[PDB]
Structure formats: structure tokens, C-alpha cells
Design a protein around this ligand. Sequence first.
Ligand SMILES: O=c1[nH]cnc2c1ncn2[C@@H]1O[C@H](COP(=O)(O)O)[C@@H](O)[C@H]1O
Ligand SMILES: O=c1[nH]cnc2c1ncn2[C@@H]1O[C@H](COP(=O)(O)O)[C@@H](O)[C@H]1O
Ligand SMILES: [Cl-]
Ligand SMILES: [Cl-]
Ligand SMILES: [Mg+2]
Ligand SMILES: [Mg+2]
Ligand SMILES: [Mg+2]
Ligand SMILES: [Mg+2]
Lengths: 179, 179
Amino acid sequence: ARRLELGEALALGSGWRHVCHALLYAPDPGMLFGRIPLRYAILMQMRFDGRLGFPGGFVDTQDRSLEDGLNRELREELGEAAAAFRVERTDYRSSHVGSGPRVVAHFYAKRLTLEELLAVEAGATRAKDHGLEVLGLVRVPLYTLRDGVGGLPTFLENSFIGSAREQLLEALQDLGLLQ
Amino acid sequence: ARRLELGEALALGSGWRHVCHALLYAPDPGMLFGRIPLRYAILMQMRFDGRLGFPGGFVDTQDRSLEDGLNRELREELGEAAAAFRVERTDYRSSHVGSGPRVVAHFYAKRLTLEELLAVEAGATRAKDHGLEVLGLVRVPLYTLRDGVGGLPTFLENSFIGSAREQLLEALQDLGLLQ
Ligand SMILES: O=c1[nH]cnc2c1ncn2[C@@H]1O[C@H](COP(=O)(O)O)[C@@H](O)[C@H]1O
Ligand SMILES: O=c1[nH]cnc2c1ncn2[C@@H]1O[C@H](COP(=O)(O)O)[C@@H](O)[C@H]1O
Ligand SMILES: [Cl-]
Ligand SMILES: [Cl-]
Ligand SMILES: [Mg+2]
Ligand SMILES: [Mg+2]
Ligand SMILES: [Mg+2]
Ligand SMILES: [Mg+2]
């Protein structure tokens, strides 16, 4: 997929559709097996097509902004606990265009408290999309286990939608997790 | 992995450890996009190692039966809603031994009502293992989308622990889903 500057994406003609997705994350002081730092809780979802992706969806003709569309979709996807926050332009990270349909994909990362993130997980089964478009939420393991394979490297071998794997890796880099 | 009859597995010496996992499923009359029959809700979990597997765990020295160990582990894994049912010997399907450590893996499939299954999903964030060994629950997409790839075939391209992919496929066959 080609990366576009936000200005260029916003200048695309009306035939282009805009989709927005968000990486929700929270600092986590927890330790797996009492010794492996978790560092952050970072959410993805298993999608209806058997691929991992981020929560979000299409901006429609009555969204006044990309961010209004994103928050509307997040709340459909994830349920009422997503109404505890708004993802904003300050959280914007990137825009990409893939091959095929006229779709531009905008990506955001939003910091939550761990309590807010847990609340999103705890309420997700009541979301409109649960058991339809969204098959379940999962956290991303950020550590690599002693065999050098288990954890993040194996997680990254799963199937991902569109540019989601690249969006994840860019965000993990920006968080200082790939040093 | 080699398949063993239950009698043979139960005759293994004390140095062998026994692990038990369960496929929990419920009939689901729902339709994706109003046209694709879901057929069943079937649960798996994203594990700490980045692989998909089934809920369960090790039988210990104070479990009086394989099934007591299974139910104890399920309830640690999944939380209080798993106490609404017991997986029993009538639900037993298979035993396998892989290479390496002395572990025999017993597999079960347990029918729930859709309300019971939803309750398991709805309560899983309060489980002891949530955000540690268990990164999230996911449903298995049983359909194949119009491109011939999306849905089950793509789901099966994800990373799976041990014999979990084979256990899934055997269960799906037994349910008549691979006709
Ligand atoms: O998490 C994601 N990151 C980036 N693009 C995505 C993600 N999820 C869906 N898409 C894209 O969003 C559009 C709609 O996909 P859908 O979710 O299958 O309806 C397609 O162009 C997908 O590639
Ligand atoms: O869902 C599963 N199906 C079959 N074996 C499993 C499953 N999950 C874990 N195991 C096995 O259970 C044992 C313990 O694995 P652990 O969950 O990583 O502690 C190993 O022998 C794994 O291969
Ligand atoms: Cl380890
Ligand atoms: Cl389709
Ligand atoms: Mg969505
Ligand atoms: Mg949507
Ligand atoms: Mg377990
Ligand atoms: Mg356990």
C-alpha cells in the first residue's frame, strides 16, 4: 500500500471512500509468569473473515469529520465503554491506499487507562457487531518468550487484514517496543 | 501427534502429565450480513504465545478425574460463567501424544446454549488468566465467503498450538460442517 499525506487523502474525489481504524492501548505494569513485563495492553480483533485487524470502519456521508466517523464505528464495534473516550486528530498516525477499490485507510492510536481498556474488553460482547463482523477482541503479546519464537514473533505470523500488520509494527516502533 | 485410546493414556506412568482442553459450542440461528448462516458459535482463545488454542490446562495431583481437572482449569481460564456447566466423560473425543515432553492431551467438545456461551464470553475478562495466559476469546468463522478464501479457510491459516487445528477440524467434521 502507498502512504499518503492527510491533505492529499482529504483532497480525493467523492468516489473515494474513507475507512478509519484505531489501535487502543494502555500501560500495564503486569508480569506474565511473574517475570515477563507485559508493558502495554494493546487491542486487536478477530474479524468475520478470519483475519486480525483493528476496530473501526467506513466514514459515511453524514460524518462531519474523519474522527466523528471513527468514533461512531468504534462504538458500534466495541460497545458503550468506547463512549468513555474520543479518538481525535491528535491521535492520527497515517493514511494508506492499497490496490483495487477506491478506499483510503486512516490509522490512529489512542492511549487509555488500563481500567478504560478493560472496560472495553468487558463490554464488547454487547456490541452491535459482536458475533457478526467482530468474532472477539485479543491483546497483542509484546514480549518474546525464551524459545525466541513464542509471543510477538508468532503473533505476527497470523493472518492480518490489509495494512494492519504494518500499522501495528509502526505503532510498536513509535512506542519504543522494537529497540 | 500419535492418537491413543483413553485406556492406554490412563495406563501411562506417573511421570506423564495429562492436559485437557475443550471446544465449547452452541447452535446459532444468526446470519452474517443477513444471508450467511453462522450455524454455531464455537470458542477458541488467543494464547500468551500468539497461537490460537482451546481453553483448558493441566490435570494436577489432587484432581480425582480428568474431567475434574478440565472443569477446574476451564473455570480459571474463562471465569464464573464456566461454572454453569460441567464437561463430562460423555463429551470426551480424543487423546494425543506429541513429540518431546511426556504430556498426553485429551480433547472434549461440550454443547452449550447460546445464552450460556455468550455468558462465558461476557465474563471472560474477570477470569484469573485474562491478560496473562489468555489474551482473548474468539469465535471460529464456519462459513467461506464469496472469494473462496475469507472465513474458515483463512482462519485455519493462523498459528495454532500443538494439535489444536486437528482437534478443531475433527470436531467440525463430527458436526457435519465440512460436507
Ligand atoms: O485494521 C485495519 N487496518 C487497515 N485497513 C483495514 C483494517 N480493517 C479493515 N481495513 C480495510 O478497510 C476496508 C474495509 O474492509 P472490511 O472491514 O472488510 O469491510 C478495506 O479496504 C480493508 O482493507
Ligand atoms: O488447545 C490445545 N489443544 C491441544 N493441546 C494443547 C492445547 N493448548 C495447549 N496444548 C498442549 O498443552 C500442553 C501445555 O501447553 P501450554 O498451554 O503452553 O502450557 C502442551 O503439550 C501443549 O501442546
Ligand atoms: Cl518463557
Ligand atoms: Cl461475501
Ligand atoms: Mg468495524
Ligand atoms: Mg462498520
Ligand atoms: Mg489454560
Ligand atoms: Mg492452567
